[PDB]
Design a protein around this motif. Sequence first.
Motif, PDB file in Angstrom:
ATOM      1  N   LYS A   1       0.850  -1.184   0.000  1.00 51.41           N
ATOM      2  CA  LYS A   1       0.000   0.000   0.000  1.00 51.41           C
ATOM      3  C   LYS A   1       0.887   1.236   0.000  1.00 51.41           C
ATOM      4  CE  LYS A   1      -1.906  -3.300   2.958  1.00 51.41           C
ATOM      5  NZ  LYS A   1      -1.847  -4.319   1.872  1.00 51.41           N
ATOM      6  N   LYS A   2       0.801   2.025  -1.064  1.00 51.83           N
ATOM      7  CA  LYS A   2       1.570   3.253  -1.200  1.00 51.83           C
ATOM      8  C   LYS A   2       0.633   4.440  -1.046  1.00 51.83           C
ATOM      9  CE  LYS A   2       3.184   2.575  -5.227  1.00 51.83           C
ATOM     10  NZ  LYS A   2       3.897   2.900  -6.495  1.00 51.83           N
ATOM     11  N   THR A   3       1.003   5.374  -0.179  1.00 50.44           N
ATOM     12  CA  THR A   3       0.187   6.560  -0.003  1.00 50.44           C
ATOM     13  C   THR A   3       0.298   7.450  -1.236  1.00 50.44           C
ATOM     14  OG1 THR A   3      -0.324   8.376   1.514  1.00 50.44           O
ATOM     15  CG2 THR A   3       1.998   7.923   1.059  1.00 50.44           C
ATOM     16  N   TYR A   4      -0.699   8.321  -1.411  1.00 53.15           N
ATOM     17  CA  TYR A   4      -0.724   9.162  -2.601  1.00 53.15           C
ATOM     18  C   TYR A   4       0.520  10.028  -2.705  1.00 53.15           C
ATOM     19  CZ  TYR A   4      -5.402   7.934  -4.133  1.00 53.15           C
ATOM     20  OH  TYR A   4      -6.499   7.263  -4.622  1.00 53.15           O
ATOM     21  N   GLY A   5       1.146  10.356  -1.575  1.00 56.94           N
ATOM     22  CA  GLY A   5       2.397  11.092  -1.630  1.00 56.94           C
ATOM     23  C   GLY A   5       3.471  10.348  -2.398  1.00 56.94           C
ATOM     24  N   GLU A   6       3.586   9.038  -2.166  1.00 55.98           N
ATOM     25  CA  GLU A   6       4.597   8.254  -2.868  1.00 55.98           C
ATOM     26  C   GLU A   6       4.238   8.068  -4.335  1.00 55.98           C
ATOM     27  OE1 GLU A   6       6.068   4.886  -0.369  1.00 55.98           O
ATOM     28  OE2 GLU A   6       4.240   5.243   0.796  1.00 55.98           O
ATOM     29  N   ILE A   7       2.978   7.736  -4.626  1.00 59.29           N
ATOM     30  CA  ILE A   7       2.593   7.456  -6.002  1.00 59.29           C
ATOM     31  C   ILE A   7       2.672   8.734  -6.824  1.00 59.29           C
ATOM     32  CG2 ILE A   7       0.913   5.984  -4.854  1.00 59.29           C
ATOM     33  CD1 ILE A   7      -1.215   7.485  -6.681  1.00 59.29           C
ATOM     34  N   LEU A   8       3.025   8.586  -8.096  1.00 60.96           N
ATOM     35  CA  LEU A   8       3.066   9.700  -9.032  1.00 60.96           C
ATOM     36  C   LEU A   8       1.962   9.511 -10.062  1.00 60.96           C
ATOM     37  CD1 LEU A   8       4.398  12.287 -10.009  1.00 60.96           C
ATOM     38  CD2 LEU A   8       5.929  10.903 -11.425  1.00 60.96           C
ATOM     39  N   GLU A   9       1.015  10.443 -10.086  1.00 61.19           N
ATOM     40  CA  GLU A   9      -0.068  10.457 -11.058  1.00 61.19           C
ATOM     41  C   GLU A   9       0.031  11.735 -11.875  1.00 61.19           C
ATOM     42  OE1 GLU A   9      -3.569  10.016  -8.737  1.00 61.19           O
ATOM     43  OE2 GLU A   9      -3.103  11.657  -7.351  1.00 61.19           O
ATOM     44  N   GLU A  10       0.132  11.590 -13.192  1.00 59.56           N
ATOM     45  CA  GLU A  10       0.355  12.748 -14.045  1.00 59.56           C
ATOM     46  C   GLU A  10      -0.849  13.678 -14.035  1.00 59.56           C
ATOM     47  OE1 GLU A  10       2.646  14.121 -14.985  1.00 59.56           O
ATOM     48  OE2 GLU A  10       1.800  15.670 -16.296  1.00 59.56           O
ATOM     49  N   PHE A  11      -0.574  14.978 -13.980  1.00 65.21           N
ATOM     50  CA  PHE A  11      -1.604  16.006 -13.988  1.00 65.21           C
ATOM     51  C   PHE A  11      -1.834  16.490 -15.412  1.00 65.21           C
ATOM     52  CE2 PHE A  11      -2.690  20.522 -14.006  1.00 65.21           C
ATOM     53  CZ  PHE A  11      -3.875  20.503 -13.302  1.00 65.21           C
TER      54      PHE A  11
ATOM     55  N   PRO B   1      -3.653  19.293 -17.426  1.00 64.52           N
ATOM     56  CA  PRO B   1      -4.331  20.569 -17.177  1.00 64.52           C
ATOM     57  C   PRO B   1      -5.549  20.728 -18.074  1.00 64.52           C
ATOM     58  CG  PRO B   1      -2.401  20.931 -18.518  1.00 64.52           C
ATOM     59  CD  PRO B   1      -2.364  19.478 -18.115  1.00 64.52           C
ATOM     60  N   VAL B   2      -6.646  21.206 -17.489  1.00 67.13           N
ATOM     61  CA  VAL B   2      -7.839  21.534 -18.261  1.00 67.13           C
ATOM     62  C   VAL B   2      -7.727  22.986 -18.696  1.00 67.13           C
ATOM     63  CG1 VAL B   2     -10.342  21.386 -18.356  1.00 67.13           C
ATOM     64  CG2 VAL B   2      -9.072  19.943 -16.764  1.00 67.13           C
ATOM     65  N   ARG B   3      -7.066  23.217 -19.824  1.00 66.98           N
ATOM     66  CA  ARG B   3      -6.849  24.570 -20.317  1.00 66.98           C
ATOM     67  C   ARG B   3      -7.540  24.796 -21.655  1.00 66.98           C
ATOM     68  NH1 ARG B   3      -1.326  24.236 -17.956  1.00 66.98           N
ATOM     69  NH2 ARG B   3      -0.660  23.227 -19.899  1.00 66.98           N
TER      70      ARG B   3
END
Lengths: 121, 168
Positions: free
Chosen positions: A107-117, A119-121
């Motif tokens: 179990k990895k906390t969201y801090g550890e995991i990298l999820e690409e952002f 942008p809604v531009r």
Amino acid sequence: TMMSGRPGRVPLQFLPNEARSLPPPKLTDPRLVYMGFLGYCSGLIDNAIRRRPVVSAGLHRQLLYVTSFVFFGYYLLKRQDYMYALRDHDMFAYVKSHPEDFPEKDKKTYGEILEEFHPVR
Amino acid sequence: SWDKDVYPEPPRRTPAPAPQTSLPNPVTYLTKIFDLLVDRPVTLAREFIEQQHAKNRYYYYHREFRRVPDITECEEKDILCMFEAEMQWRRDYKVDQEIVNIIQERLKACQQREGESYRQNCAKELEQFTQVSKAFQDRYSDLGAHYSARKCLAKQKQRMLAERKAAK
């Protein structure tokens, strides 16, 4: 298929004795009430088809409709619950018996995991 | 009853009346007429209503929300912790919006109050709003209609990785 060949299944038995361990369906279950509603609708449709007064004629017949539908629905609900409980029992037993196929995951906390952002531009 | 620190107003400097002409000033007499006809009745009515309010005084309280673990410390698929953290993030989003609103109100009041010297004498408030707007835009802008704590976290992570690359 699936549960048909489950070991120990007595042929042509609606409710096995094992089901009695499960709680019986409550007589106030919404599903059973809906079955009774179906019976009432059946009585009304019968009166309409025979051109009798729809809502007042044949109260004994409507009572029989409702009682028969509730009576069958109680056992149908009991069998449905038994079948789902059997499914859950077998699923958990299989998970326990095959630990490798169902491995615990780190179990990895969201801090550890990298999820690409994105942008809604 | 608003706090002066939260809503700053420069001290009022009002020139004293220095008449240089014999003609009676119409504004003075009209203002006295206004005071007598309107202001005194309004003041008496408010006095009566305030007495009535004082007769039955009851209090309302400002709710306090204890800080809860953030999304960064919430495990994946932990819907309880994620729900708590997301609600906290949304509350903070609203609070930051209100902060930006307060600074903008300062900005507009300064524009009105200074007058023709707004460009120079409102510089400090404009700098405050510039800082606040940059911070708010960086934190929350571009997240989209379905904004979530996770997406803001992802944007912050992207920014931090870009900063590390700038460090080279």
